[PDB]
Structure 1
Amino acid sequence: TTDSFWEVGNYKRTVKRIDDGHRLCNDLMNCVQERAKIEKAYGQQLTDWAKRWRQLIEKGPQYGSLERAWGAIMTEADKVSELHQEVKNNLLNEDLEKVKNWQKDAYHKQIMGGFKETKEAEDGFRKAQKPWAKKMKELEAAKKAYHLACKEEKLAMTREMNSKTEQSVTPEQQKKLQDKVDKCKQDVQKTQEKYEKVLEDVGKTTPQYMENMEQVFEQCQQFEEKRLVFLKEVLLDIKRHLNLAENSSYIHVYRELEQAIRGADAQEDLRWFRSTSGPGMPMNWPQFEEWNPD
């Protein structure tokens, strides 16, 4: 657990959380316009289709009702395109804009450093960790000293046993073997009293450490929460604006196309042609013609 929140210098992860917040806003904005582009393309593709074929049918050999039928399928194209433009718009007028604004209130860059709120936190954390930071260094100092002190007690306590294995003219060196082994014995007992002293000491200051880091933290959560809430609301706003269905207009388009079509009557059609281009049209039959004369 060297990667735990309580380990000195780890609150940083949640400090990052903040710089991230602004960045994700950024992201949602880029997502939105991208959507728009797509929505603009479709409906712009649409009217370009409506026009081409509107003109084609009107210049064309088609006639009568069938012409108007096949006609209406261009207004569809148009109406739908107008919707997808409605859609583009909102993504860009409301939804996008909302984010751009919210992001302008929550975060503010500062000339020296990053965001203001990022600092306020970053300092809050240091502040609450300072005390525990100091102590925690004492601690690893004393351990470091005490271990060393126990390594030396084993440096001479066994060495004496190796030096008295020589048993060769060392009455002055036999006194040093029992001199250092009892000197280091002092160190060990001492360091274990100092180190142990810090240990119980740190234990008296952990709650305070805890209340502390836990206070700057809940304050962080507060701010996070403020964007998480907003963000959800944005995403609803978007779904709303993306949704064509449950939009009267949309359904309306395809009822209107439908009846235009069924409206087509080949009979009336056929009759028109008869009267307009066929035997139905008047004919001057040969008649006895006198001289003009001029």
Structure 2
Amino acid sequence: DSFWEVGNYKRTVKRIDDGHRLCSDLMNCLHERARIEKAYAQQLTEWARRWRQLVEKGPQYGTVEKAWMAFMSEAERVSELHLEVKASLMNDDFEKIKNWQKEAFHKQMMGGFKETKEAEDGFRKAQKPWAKKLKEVEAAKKAHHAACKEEKLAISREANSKDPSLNEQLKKLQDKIEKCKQDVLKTKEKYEKSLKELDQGTPQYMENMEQVFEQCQQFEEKRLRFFREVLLEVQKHLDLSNVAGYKAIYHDLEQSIRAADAVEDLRWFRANHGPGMAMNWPQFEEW
């Protein structure tokens, strides 16, 4: 249940497979955002294309037609602006994480990552002496839970011994007890002797596990620091107020709307479609 138990390092070795996994989960996350931005872009271009044709063809004209059109232009700047978020998310961040994942993790010909197997190996190897001593100890204690039982049972047999049927039979009982009692004694010493060695062994074993562990942390710290550095970059690319000309799109929009002059427009109609027009007052044609 705890890290020091044999093989309970399985977790810190898994963190490295998780390490790779997360480089993809993050790429996918960005990748999907990218499509969202380009979709909105696409929609905006479409809208402006649609409405450019409709305003040209329709009956709105003049400086109020200009103001209307202004709006399909701002859609076109916004479209370009979100389109290059896709561009930044994709060309840069995604590829940064992809290249990092190539340089940090390495698939091997018959398995997983070199990294994973290396941590998995240094762990096995720093745990090996001490796990050996452990099996030694457990076997010994079991051989001491065995002698104990048999001795106790020979002793019960003496209880059965106080049967009026016989009595070579008792002597055997006493001798059996003596040896069993003695054998309990030896197995005892063996066991506690092996337990001692395990304790000394343990300070040394403890050193080797931490050596291995602290370079698992190290590698992991690299991935964490990268996530940090890169997410700070991602957020710049998302921020459109980080763009110089964003503000200008709106300033230009405003300017175009302001220009629309109702009167300039009214004077254009009078002269081109109204009373302001040239007329050939009827004349007398001979012939």
- Give the TM interval when normalised to the shorter protein: over 0.9
- Aligned residue for 1:24? 22
In the alignment, the residues of structure 2 paired with residue 158 and residue 249 of structure 1 have an alpha-carbon distance, to the nearest angstrom, of 98
CA distance in 1, matches of 2:280, 2:128: 114
207-216 vs 150-159, which deviates more?
150-159
Q: Return the alpha-carbon distance in structure 2 between the equivalents of residues 14 and 115 of structure 1.
A: 14
Are 2:216 and 1:208 equivalent residues in the alignment?
no
Structure 1 residues without counterparts, runs of 5 or longer: none
Moved over 6 A (4+): none
SS of aligned partner of 2:96: helix
Task: Give the whole-Å Cα distance in 1 for the aligned partners of 2:176 and 2:74.
Answer: 101
Q: Name the structure 2 match of 1:161.
A: 159
| Corresponding residue for residue 248 of structure 2 | 252
**Per-residue CA distance 1:130-168 (angstroms, 9 max, x = gap):** 11111010011111111112222221223322331xx32
Match of residue 268, structure 1, among 264, 267, 280? 264
Distance in 1 between residues matched to 2:228 and 2:5, nearest whole Å: 33
CA pair 152-278 structure 1, distance change in 2 beyond 3 A: same
**1:148 and 1:21 mapped to 2: Cα distance?**
48
- For 2:254 and 2:187, the matched residues in 1 are separated by 94
| Residues 104-113 or 225-234, more deviating | 104-113
Structure 2: distance between partners of 1:205 and 1:26: 42
What do residues 2-39 of structure 1 show as CA deviations (whole Å, max 9, x unaligned)? x2111111212111212222222122222222121111
Aligned partner of 2:43 in structure 1 is: 45
Alignment root-mean-square deviation, CA: 1.7
Q: Distance in 1 between matches of 2:261 and 2:172?
A: 125
Report the secondary structure of 1:158's partner residue. Answer: helix
The partner residue of 1:125 within 123, 126, 132 is 123
Tell me the matched-pair count.
287
Partner of residue 214 from structure 2, selected from 215, 218, 241: 218
Aligned partner letter, 2:93: D
Moved more, 230-239 or 267-276: 267-276
1:278 corresponds, among 274, 277, 284, to 274
Aligned-partner Cα distance in 2 for 1:109–1:144:
44
Q: Distance in 1 between matches of 2:131 and 2:120?
A: 15
Instruction: Name 1:14's counterpart in structure 2.
Output: 12
The answer on 1:98 being equivalent to 2:96 is yes
- For 1:222, give the aligned amino acid: Q
**1:185 maps to which residue?**
181
Per-residue deviation, 1:116: 1.6
TM-score (norm 2): 0.94
TM-superposed deviation, 1:235: 1.0
Q: Distance in 2 between the 1:225 and 1:246 partners? A: 30
1:77 and 1:140 map into 2 onto residues whose CA distance is 76
Q: Note the alpha carbon deviations across 1:202-250, whole angstroms, 9 max, x for none.
A: 1111111001100011111111111111121111111111111232222
Q: Indicate whether 1:174 and 2:170 are aligned.
A: yes
Specify the code of the residue in structure 1 equivalent to 2:219: F
Give the whole-Å Cα distance in 1 for the aligned partners of 2:52 and 2:275: 31
Q: In structure 1, what residue type is equivalent to 2:54? A: L
What is the Cα deviation at residue 286 of structure 1? 4.6
Counterpart of 1:130 in structure 2: which amino acid?
K
Aligned-pair identity in percent equals 72
Distance in 2 (CA, whole Å) between partners of 1:126 and 1:30 is 34
Q: Distance in 2 between matches of 1:131 and 1:266?
A: 94
Residue aligning to 2:80: 82
Q: 2:270–2:276: 8 Å Cα contact kept in structure 1?
A: yes
- C-alpha contact 2:63 2:261 (8 A) present in aligned 1: yes
How far is 1:101 from its partner?
1.2
Quote the offset at 1:77 in angstroms: 1.0
